[PDB]
Design a protein around this ligand. Structure first.
Ligand SMILES: O=[N+]([O-])c1ccc(O)c(O)c1
Ligand SMILES: O=[N+]([O-])c1ccc(O)c(O)c1
Ligand SMILES: O=[N+]([O-])c1ccc(O)c(O)c1
Ligand SMILES: O=[N+]([O-])c1ccc(O)c(O)c1
Ligand SMILES: O=[N+]([O-])c1ccc(O)c(O)c1
Ligand SMILES: [Cl-]
Ligand SMILES: [Cl-]
Ligand SMILES: [Cl-]
Ligand SMILES: [Cl-]
Ligand SMILES: [Cl-]
Ligand SMILES: [Fe+3]
Ligand SMILES: [Fe+3]
Ligand SMILES: [Fe+3]
Ligand SMILES: [Fe+3]
Lengths: 200, 238, 238, 200, 238, 200, 200
């Protein structure tokens, strides 16, 4: 058969990933511009929300050295790919779990709906890639929102998950953090309540 | 804004390391036990950030000067350069390449690294750059030392530099590690060996590149990176 | 005082590098053009200094501590150990082993080395010890970096440690260089290549020795040295 | 035939040999005990002499980075092999050429006569081993003395040199340095007046 | 009292059988699912019992006479002998070697063995001895018969003798099994095959040793044992 | 790299291990001297303690054919390697689980504190090696004591276990058995509450 | 290591090189435009100079079939690569030794100072490549000027020649030929007074 050049194989990001990708957290000085966890200037169109979560290993223990990259549509359902700290909104961001509480946070707006390749609307979602010590190749997931139940029920991607119970692992829970709208999205890498991870 | 106009070759997850590779101990509890769920590519997966407009500092790519506290870092001065192409051989221009590493003695400037080898007051350990219009990148740095770590009772990472590459989409984004030609620690590392196929391991080994060295100054290593092949859509929804 | 009571196997001067090896440029004007004159072994050649009574300082063998100016040297912590035997396989005990080298960046602490890589304020670069009663020696040091030098326009010594070994006589005394397993600079060096036979080159390459490493501390390299075989006289003057 | 283990191959001492073997000269601090160029305490039996010399390459230029090891009998013709800085006399010493003038010096006594293995007396001699950048394997020679002409004429080692003219390369010239007895022994590595070098 | 003065080469746990080897069915539920926790060697691990003053009976090493009920056991009379050394090749003198096995028919003298082949009234199946000052041990016994066991539906242990060896510390203590040259059951056994590397399997196979046999009397097999290499501490806490 | 002779590979002790190493348990006669489960004669210095435990597989079922070897300091924190059944104390002993109840017992004294190689005190501990049918290479663990909470908190070995929860699996529980001080130490080879096992 | 395409290997130009590269000298008719030995028309800025020289082999005998190529800055220290016979000045020229006398000549202007890559001024120089029968790969040298003593002493290129004596082999001698300023530059390929040749 036709065989292309092989892709460069993945390796773990390792425990000191912060030195390269999360400078403040590693304990180091930051450069003038950093790619980080504030996707929206206060000005940006849409409903401003806080996202936060903790990450659990197969033993139910906090993964305190996780590194997360996110990609989401803006409030108007447009992917803003021209990354710029001067942008009202960036579709891309990065975050990491604090070593003490093991919690990451992201400041964003709720994404608008986009269609899949067949033209079917997907429920509002944030694409997530999870990296850490002990993770050889990053894990893909999606965060959807519990106050979008009608959309989530019809999502052509959620519906590819064979078991209804596993779809629940992807639905972030609306709550309030310091009085502000938030959604909690905990990730369980392994075992009971294991988060659905995707290949594409 | 971004558009869905391409598809990316499916990953070979037997070429990449699998999730569960128990000799690498932390992988045991941090690997899923359920199968990944395959999903078709949509705009969500086939687009991603472009960093053309990110503001890079003058020394962002040069670890010999980007943590200057009065002197040069101690260690083997090296250029690490190469090309980012996709699996079709197409160059991947204007793409973000990030790297980070320990100092010459295998010590990381991270608060969680308590290895007894000293920090270097003139070495930070992070670099970044965009590939040029032809897919080439380059960094200048010190060759990192082996780093002992609590896996087995006597385990030592080979000299290595961590790499992250964005590429054209979130589907292409990759984190990996560069190793150095001939390092006898490579066959012994459980993290290297998370990769089952030795030919895949070979793809992570940078080669000495004398052609690219500055005489009386610094040596050079060549490390090329291949991201998933990108193609146009064809015959979809018909 | 010393006595003539042994004979030493004749050197193979095609196993050793020859004097004239023009790729190593300084050898051209510093090699004899007349043949060496062979002479029989007498007391003058079959005896030599024994250093059992030389006074060694506490850190003479430990380059991590013997140039202490407030900190540890930066670089890959390594033990270099091995055994000195003669060509008959007999251990050579209580023999002087001296070594010297550049720092982690290929800079020598010598006033004539103006390479731009910085000196390390906590690294001197000299070690010495006697082999033990079983012929074993050991040093602790930092792995030296490659050193560029004005031979060809882009020539670089591999990582190397210089060794001098006294042995039982002036006939056995040897100066050599240790190289490191897998270093891709080794086949390229005109000084390495002054040795014509690649199997002779192999005898100068120290092997990674994980068995001898201190976990979470320092790696180790093994470098064994073979001096001329020593035998009793027989059937002389009769 | 019988093949033993091969000897470890020689390599050049390199230009920075002083770091390891001639610390002061490299510009470095010395250790409490160093093996160096004073073989005799003022007390030692025998005629105290100074030896000095310069070393020339094939172009007639000074080899300013030479390193020399010497081995000689004491005044009573005995080899003192138990090396000790407290000894009245050491048979072994080291020296090196100054970088400015390219001259080495050694402080010693004139050696007494020893016999070769056949029982024939050799003329008074100092065994020398020369090391330097560009010298792949060290060069062996002997320094004999011009005021020992009767002995030198009968030396069973000098007589192994086929050409009388080449024997002259090994005869050091008695002179005075600051009013003290000395012998100059210049070495010519290559070309006209090339010093005899030995294999044994 | 015992002293911490040595270190033991780290085990290769891919050379040894892994814990989880599912064809050996009982290992599925009796293997840890968490990684082993590596700890540095202390006096706790680097010391162990010395049995030089354990009182051995006259026939403790001789299974032909240590269960005497008025006759000799039935079966192939054999001497089982060899040397205990460490990985450096050092003999391991005065060490405890214990062994146990079934009779000539594959029947164990244990209440839980209900195999239908009879017990032998003159055979017990246990021996012990110390290695001598040069590391050698010797037993006399009957060659054990293959033993069927409830694993797969037609699984049979090759002829085998169980071995336990103390060595210098609890870190060297080992239990293993001896197998016999040419036994065609060896490649079929899921306990043998818990060892992944066939060269490691080969290290458990005793060789017919005609040189050690008593003519008209008993044959002999040779089974050498290698314990973890022991070396002195070096450069610790400095 | 340097490759030494390979170690003889481990194999399971098998179900009939008692016949070689725990003669009573096999249903078999003992020899004059046996290595068994009494490390301390009643006259030994230190606090006399009964130790006991059961061993569970990954399905929570008793492992009734376990063989255990133990190694511990005397009350004064010294290892006694001269094994001799005449001694008031031996640092080494052996025990096994009854086929009926699955419980092993040891009779010993509480060990004194021992320093690690860096000179840091370790909490009182007994080193255990566990062998059985289905165990291909023995499992190393340590038994510490719940009435040494202050020392356990500071143990350099305990503190190498990354999760505090797992440290608990190595703390034996003080009770009383027939008026005498005892500690229960159950081992779970696999699954929930899995005992920490060491490599060294 | 990284290995590129190998360079096409050099071969001797051979005795009849003139037929391809110095047409007059071969005894042959010239074409309309030839690359020859006049780098400066009489109108060129700078000091007009005749250069001449002979070439000697290792036996001190004239090399009568030499071909030389030269490359030099104009009087203002700039290299002019746009070769054109209309130019007042060309930085490139060619010459050859007469078969009869063995002497080559060039007509040029004294080059101005050029900085090296580190910004250090080099003394006025002409780059020369020498080709001939018996020369397997061309020899690179430089012609400097004896009336630039101060600049020669400071040249970073001259100072890469380790022995001061050898530096002299590259200094052309000012004279007068028929009232006009000239410099003689003899090259000795081998032996006594051997001209320094470069690798770059
Ligand atoms: O635990 N890991 O994954 C590690 C430990 C050390 C490293 O240098 C690394 O790159 C990864
Ligand atoms: O010129 N040499 O001989 C050299 C130059 C640099 C070196 O590091 C060396 O060992 C020898
Ligand atoms: O792996 N096996 O099964 C083996 C390996 C070596 C042998 O000699 C054998 O009889 C069987
Ligand atoms: O189950 N096992 O482990 C067994 C069964 C029978 C045996 O003879 C043995 O050595 C091991
Ligand atoms: O002497 N040579 O160099 C020669 C002689 C004849 C040739 O045709 C040539 O190319 C070179
Ligand atoms: Cl936790
Ligand atoms: Cl820069
Ligand atoms: Cl020390
Ligand atoms: Cl000179
Ligand atoms: Cl004995
Ligand atoms: Fe790393
Ligand atoms: Fe060197
Ligand atoms: Fe068995
Ligand atoms: Fe031709």
């Amino acid at each position: 058969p036709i065989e292309l050049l092989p892709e460069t194989p993945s390796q773990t990001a390792g425990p000191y990933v912060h030195i390269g990708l999360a400078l403040e957290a590693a304990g180091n000085p930051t450069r003038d511009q950093e790619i980080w966890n504030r996707l929206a200037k206060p000005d940006a169109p849409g409903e401003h929300i806080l996202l936060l979560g903790q990450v659990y290993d197969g033993n139910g223990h906090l993964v305190r050295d996780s590194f997360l990259e996110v990609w989401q549509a803006d409030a108007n359902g447009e992917y803003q790919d021209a990354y710029n700290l001067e942008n009202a909104f960036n579709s891309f961001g990065r975050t990491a779990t604090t070593f003490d509480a093991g919690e990451w946070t992201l400041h964003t707006v709720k994404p608008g709906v986009v269609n899949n390749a067949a033209g079917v609307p997907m429920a509002p979602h944030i694409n997530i890639s999870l990296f850490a010590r002990g993770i050889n190749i990053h894990l893909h997931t999606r965060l959807y929102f519990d106050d979008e139940a009608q959309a989530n029920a019809k999502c052509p991607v959620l519906n590819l998950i064979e078991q209804p119970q596993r779809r629940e692992t992807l639905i972030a829970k609306r709550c309030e953090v310091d009085g502000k709208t938030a959604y909690r999205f905990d990730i369980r890498i392994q075992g009971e309540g294991e988060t659905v991870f995707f290949d594409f | 804004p971004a558009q869905d106009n391409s598809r990316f070759v499916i990953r070979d997850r037997n070429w990449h390391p699998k999730a569960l590779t128990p000799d690498y101990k932390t992988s045991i509890a941090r690997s899923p036990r359920q199968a990944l769920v395959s999903i078709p590519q949509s705009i969500s997966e086939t687009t991603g950030p472009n960093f053309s407009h990110l503001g890079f500092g003058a020394h962002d790519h040069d670890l010999l000067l980007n943590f200057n506290n009065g002197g040069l870092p101690i260690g083997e001065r090296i250029i690490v350069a190469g090309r980012v192409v996709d699996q079709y051989g197409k160059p991947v221009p204007n793409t973000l390449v990030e790297m980070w590493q320990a100092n010459a003695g295998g010590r990381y400037r991270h608060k969680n690294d308590r290895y007894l080898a000293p920090l270097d007051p003139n070495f930070g350990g992070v670099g970044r750059c965009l590939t040029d219009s032809d897919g080439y990148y380059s960094f200048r740095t010190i060759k990192p030392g082996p780093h002992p770590w609590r896996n087995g009772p006597n385990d030592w990472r080979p000299a290595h530099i961590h790499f992250g590459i964005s590429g054209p989409s979130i589907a292409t984004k990759l984190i990996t590690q560069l190793y150095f030609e001939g390092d006898p620690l490579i066959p012994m590392c459980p993290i290297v060996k998370s990769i089952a196929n030795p030919e895949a391991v070979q793809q992570l080994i940078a080669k000495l590149d004398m052609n690219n060295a500055n005489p009386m100054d610094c040596l050079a290593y060549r490390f090329d990176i291949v991201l998933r092949g990108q193609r146009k859509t064809h015959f979809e929804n018909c």
